[PDB]
Amino acid sequence: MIKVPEDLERIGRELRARGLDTKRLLEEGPKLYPELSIPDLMAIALYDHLNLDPEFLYRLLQQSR
Amino acid sequence: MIKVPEDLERIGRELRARGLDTKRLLEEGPKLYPELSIPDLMAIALYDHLNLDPEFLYRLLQQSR
């Protein structure tokens, strides 16, 4: 589902808009987005609280794969 | 290298003590700890800035594996 950095940002914005802080995002994120990997959701959590460049997080995710 | 939650906390404390913020931790962490996976380092980054329970992050890492 994360084919480009834009997808990381889109899903991240969506989950945070629900009111999910980082812990709740890591608990609810996987239920709402079962197609994402745990590393995907950790990267989204980092984007959502620290506003790290989605390009950087995307590149890190590519390495892990 | 992360066989228990204690290892996540130990390495996290070590990297943050060097002055590494989250972005620099994700850039320098892999160089300093080449034995860790990218998901390992993302979990350590989450612990170091948000103080999420290392037990929770450890359990998430087990799932990914």
Numbering used by the authors:
A (entry chain A), B (entry chain A): 1 to 65
Sentences from the paper on this structure:
The loss function guiding the search is computed by inputting N copies of the sequence into the AlphaFold2 (AF2) network, and combining structure prediction confidence metrics (pLDDT; per-residue structural accuracy, and pTM; an estimate of the TM-score) with a measure of cyclic symmetry (the standard deviation of the distances between the center of mass of adjacent protomers within the predicted structure).
All crystal structures had the correct oligomerization state and closely matched the design models (median Cα RMSD of 0.6 Å across all designs, with resolutions ranging from 1.8 to 3.4 Å). HALC2_068 is a fully helical dimer with an extensive interface formed by 6 interacting helices (3 from each protomer), with a single perpendicular helix buttressing the interfacial helices. Despite the low secondary structure complexity and absence of long-range contacts, this design also differs significantly from its closest structural relative in the PDB (TM-score: 0.57).
